[PDB]
Scaffold this active site. Structure first.
Site: not given
Ligand SMILES: CCCCCCCCCCCCCCCCCC(=O)OC[C@H](COP(=O)([O-])OCC[N+](C)(C)C)OC(=O)CCCCCCCCCCCCCCCCC
Ligand SMILES: CCCCCCCCCCC[C@H](O)CC(=O)SCCNC(=O)CCNC(=O)[C@H](O)C(C)(C)COP(=O)(O)O
Ligand SMILES: Nc1nc2c(ncn2[C@@H]2O[C@H](COP(=O)(O)OP(=O)(O)OP(=O)(O)O)[C@@H](O)[C@H]2O)c(=O)[nH]1
Ligand SMILES: [Mg+2]
Lengths: 115, 85, 115, 320, 97, 53
Positions: B39-40
């Site tokens: 996940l960014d």
């Protein structure tokens, strides 16, 4: 010299903060935006249509350009709070009625002289 | 009914998996979101949102930037609304 | 029952006018025509939010004054009594009492629009 | 016989007496910043009444013969002890601030009572609105405990709410290095025992809180240190001032009636300065309370009501 | 007679309506106001029936003070609506202690 | 010295109810000024769209 005067974001970190509270305002804005604005799109497609515009500008390295864009982000944001825009105005972000644009080489060759 | 550290464990654990991108298999107590969950840090925003609305408090940006693993977030909030078990 | 007959006829004749003005002259509604009017644009969304008065003070004084006039409606019959002496004083006394109440409110601001 | 509801009915108004120069003005500054002098010059220049900064025994100045009573009988708190050992376990730090708050609170009430009664302008050094800053500097240095701050802001909000901001507030800006030079020159042995962090803390909380919120409530005049000596210059600005910003103009005779009745009843004025919050320092035990109060009784001019004590020499008692 | 029954049960439901607050004071205040309408009609029915000329007095004079009670009533509701904003009796409990 | 009440004995009848229970355990003794502080701002001026028609 090449050194320049920043406005608000001295480097990436504070600029990364500024894009973050844009999300903070936007994320809680989309639900009641659809609610108030008589929109027929759900919250789900409302959320990610805020998403991809972050990657629409996820290449700039200059802090000023991010800062030059952070003002516009809250500008369209504020324009949505007080119903200033109309249904078509926000629909313009929802690309819905135009013909799909060709992508593969065979398609544009079959369409015309468009390079 | 005062909360407990175990109660905060399941509060975080529940709301972690209604996130569509968060995979339960990769989910764990030590889950570095950017590598373990993929996940960014931009995606990191909409988790702690579900934290502050469900826990009914406020997370500053100067604090939400390093809240990364499900263990870190639990001990972060535990100090905030003063649950120490 | 003569007053009943004209009352019944009057409300009847009104009802025919609305009856054939709703069925005879076509029907075509497609939502935005059915929408409320905000001088061309879309309303902020309400028409139900508290539209707080700025003249609330004078409204209640109207109730006191509209009430007290009902006390002096019997005046035409009150003139034709055997005791016009005390009738004159009592009826005068009411009018000064309204005059004093109006004078009281006038001096302590009152009638002017509360801001 | 003093102005009560009967006087209002009879004709005793108070918006008639006040004039253009009916200004209550507070000077402010850092520790030994020379603002006390500026209060004196502006007072005599425009014919304004001067009120010196309220000390521990200021209440003693307005009671009895106006002489400072015993500290153990008039506060049990010493500014020198506050200077020497700020972290004393007895708690003299909050005893200083809480007692001085009410002394300023009594100072402010008397200043407004004179202004509302005669109309002649009153000038006093600092005020209750400038009292919170001293405690804020204290908490910003480990001087005090947080519960003391909670008690102070509670009573300050409770007591200072119905009062109004003073007409004009004037501040003199003296930097901390200059302030340190002034106190060092003074030579009073208690005021070497200071902290430079405390001196910037008191200075910071003035310009960060006091002056900002006071600006929209009444006119603010930030004055340079060198400009302060020109007593001629400081008074022309206050003479031709707008005097419109704040709740002072929108004040009818009825609200003035409430203000006068509040300030004239001195017991009510500091009635809520004795909140039953049971702080370990603020609270004085029962035996101390009785003995100290029992001590207060036989002090001359204290046993009975004023004008009724035989030790004073009040005659005609049997028909007084 | 039956006309009397209809208008005393007008009181009863008005009595039930007044001392039954659901959401807001305005509805109950109106019920208090309308409560006197039965009171007016009640008192008016005997007085024309009994032909007692003087006591035609009180139906009007009951109207003086019943609506005056309402007059201070909805003016009191003004003071609520500034501090409270709304007019809800459920919120109208700041003196819980 | 005869025993005089201390701070702890004072707190006995010092709360909102000296004789408390779970129902009133979350109560709050009234403010000493007997005035509740103003709550959230309740101004909601409606927006009028003058023009362009
Ligand atoms: C008398 C009072 C009449 C009040 C209603 C008037 C009226 O016709 O309103 C339109 C309304 C609705 O009119 P309507 O029924 O023609 O509208 C819907 C029409 N369809 C069903 C075909 C879509 O009238 C009645 O409801 C012999
Ligand atoms: C329909 C509703 C109304 C209409 C709604 C749609 C209209 C309004 C859109 C508002 C958002 C706007 O487009 C984009 C912005 O705010 S800022 C982009 C910043 N771009 C960079 O700085 C380049 C590098 N980018 C990265 O490195 C990461 O991708 C990023 C930082 C973006 C996040 O990831 P991480 O935090 O690094
Ligand atoms: N806690 C507290 N201390 C005060 C108060 N007023 C004065 N003091 C103390 O008084 C001492 C001297 O400083 P100030 O009273 O500000 O000033 P000054 O030395 O009289 O000189 P000027 O500012 O020129 O009047 C310091 O110890 C201050 O902390 C007050 O209201 N509260
Ligand atoms: Mg001083």
């Amino acid at each position: 010299g090449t050194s320049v005067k920043p406005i608000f974001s001295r480097d990436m970190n504070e600029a990364k903060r500024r894009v973050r509270e844009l999300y903070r305002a936007w994320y809680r804005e989309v639900p009641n935006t659809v609610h108030l604005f008589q929109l027929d799109i759900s919250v789900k497609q409302g959320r990610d249509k805020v998403r991809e515009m972050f990657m629409k500008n996820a290449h700039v390295t200059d802090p000023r350009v991010v800062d030059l864009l952070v003002i516009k982000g809250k500008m369209e944001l504020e324009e949505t709070i007080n119903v200033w825009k109309q249904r078509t105005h926000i629909m313009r972000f929802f690309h819905e009625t135009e013909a799909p644009r060709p992508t593969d080489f065979l398609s544009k060759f079959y369409v015309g002289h468009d390079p | 009914p005062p909360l407990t550290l175990e109660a905060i464990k399941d509060r975080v654990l529940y709301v972690l998996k209604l996130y569509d991108k968060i995979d339960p298999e990769k989910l764990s107590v030590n889950s570095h979101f950017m590598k373990d969950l993929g996940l960014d840090s931009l995606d990191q925003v909409e988790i702690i949102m579900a934290m502050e609305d469900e826990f009914g408090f406020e997370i500053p940006d100067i604090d939400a930037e390093k809240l990364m693993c499900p263990q870190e977030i639990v001990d972060y909030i535990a100090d905030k609304k003063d649950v120490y078990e | 029952m003569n007053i009943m007959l004209t009352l019944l006829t009057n409300v009847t004749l009104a009802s025919l006018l609305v009856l054939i003005a709703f069925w005879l002259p076509q029907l075509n509604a497609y939502s935005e025509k059915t929408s409320p009017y905000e001088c061309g644009f879309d309303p902020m969304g309400s028409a139900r939010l508290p539209f707080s008065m700025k003249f609330f003070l004078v409204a209640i004084t109207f109730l006191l004054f509209d009430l007290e006039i009902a006390l002096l409606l019997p005046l035409p019959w009150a003139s034709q009594t055997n005791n016009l002496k005390t009738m004159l004083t009592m009826a005068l006394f009411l009018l000064i009492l309204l005059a004093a109440s109006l004078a009281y409110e006038w001096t302590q601001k009152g009638l002017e629009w509360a801001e | 016989l003093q102005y009560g509801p009967l006087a209002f009915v009879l004709g005793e108004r108070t918006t008639r007496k006040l004039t253009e120069t009916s200004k209550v003005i507070t000077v402010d500054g850092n520790i030994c910043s020379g603002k006390g002098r500026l209060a004196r010059e502006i007072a005599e220049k425009l014919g304004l009444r001067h009120f010196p900064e309220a000390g521990i025994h200021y209440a003693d100045s307005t009671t009895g013969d106006g002489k400072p009573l015993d500290v153990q009988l008039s506060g049990n708190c010493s500014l020198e002890k506050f200077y020497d050992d700020p972290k004393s376990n007895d708690g003299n730090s909050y005893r200083l601030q809480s007692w001085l708050y009410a002394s300023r609170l009594l100072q402010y009430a008397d200043a407004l009572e004179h202004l509302l009664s005669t109309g002649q302008g009153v000038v006093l050094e600092r005020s209750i609105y400038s009292d919170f800053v001293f405690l804020e500097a204290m908490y910003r240095q480990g001087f005090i405990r947080k519960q003391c701050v909670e008690h102070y802001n509670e009573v300050k909000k409770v007591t200072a709410c119905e009062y109004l901001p003073p007409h004009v507030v004037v501040y003199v800006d003296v930097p901390v290095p200059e302030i340190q030079s002034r106190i060092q020159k003074k030579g009073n042995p208690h005021e070497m025992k200071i902290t430079a962090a405390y001196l910037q803390d008191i200075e910071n909380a003035y310009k960060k809180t006091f002056l900002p919120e006071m600006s929209e409530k009444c006119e603010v005049l930030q004055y340079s240190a060198r400009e302060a000596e020109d007593a001629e210059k400081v008074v022309e600005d206050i003479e031709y001032l707008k005097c419109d910003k704040g709740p002072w103009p929108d004040q009818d005779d009825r609200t003035f009636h409430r203000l006068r009745m509040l300030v004239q009843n001195k017991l009510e004025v500091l009635n809520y300065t004795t909140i039953p919050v049971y702080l370990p320092e603020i609270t004085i035990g029962a035996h101390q309370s009785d003995r100290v109060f029992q001590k207060f009784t036989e002090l001359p001019g204290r046993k009975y009501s004023p004008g009724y004590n035989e030790d004073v020499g009040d005659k005609w008692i049997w028909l007084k | 007679p039956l006309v009397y029954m209809n208008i005393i049960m007008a009181f009863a439901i008005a009595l039930a309506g007044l001392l039954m607050y659901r959401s807001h004071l305005m509805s109950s205040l109106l019920c208090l106001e309308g409560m006197m309408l039965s009171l007016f009609i009640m008192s008016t029915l005997i007085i024309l029936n009994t032909h007692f000329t003087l006591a035609n007095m009180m139906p009007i004079i009951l109207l003086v003070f019943a609506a005056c009670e309402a007059a201070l009533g909805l003016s009191l509701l003004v003071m609520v609506s500034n501090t409270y904003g709304t007019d809800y009796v459920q919120n109208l409990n700041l003196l819980q202690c | 010295r005869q025993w005089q009440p201390d701070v702890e004995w004072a707190e006995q009848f010092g709360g909102a109810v000296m004789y408390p229970t779970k129902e009133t355990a979350h109560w709050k003794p009234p403010p000493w000024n007997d005035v509740d502080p103003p709550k959230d701002t309740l101004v909601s001026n409606l927006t009028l769209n003058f023009g362009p028609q």
